[PDB]
Amino acid sequence: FELLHAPATVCGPKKSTNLVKNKCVNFNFNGLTGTGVLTESNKKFLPF
């Protein structure tokens, strides 16, 4: 396993947890950690 000065493009981590809506939960979205309720929203996010 080589670790040089460059992006580490080989990894093994992953996390599939079941989403729950309208409930105060601790959420972790791809590295963003927070606490609150998750609701369906009408926000038009751009693709990026």
């Binding site: 040089l4 000065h5 460059a6 992006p7 493009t9 751009l46 990026f48």
Partner: protein, 78 residues
């Protein structure tokens, strides 16, 4: 011309970023006076330093005669 290509190439911490934008514009020469934000289109973990840049052109066979086009280079500053 009838089309405008806008690209931003940056290399930071081993990641190379290409931001792209297509804007159709009719102008004889020079950039149009129009504001366009460039949406990131490619992000690649290259990992190698970039100190020199060279563009690739499509040579039109007649002996080469390149097409009439304008390519603009602007250096990013902090």
């Amino acid at each position: 011309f009838k089309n405008l290509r806008e690209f931003v190439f940056k290399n930071i911490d081993g990641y190379f970023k290409i931001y792209s934008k297509h804007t159709p514009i009719n102008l004889v020469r020079d950039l149009p006076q129009g504001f366009s934000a460039l949406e990131p289109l490619v992000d690649l973990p290259i990992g190698i330093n970039i100190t020199r840049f060279q563009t690739l052109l499509a040579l039109h066979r007649s002996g080469w005669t390149a097409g009439a086009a304008a390519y603009y280079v602007g250096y990013l500053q902090p």
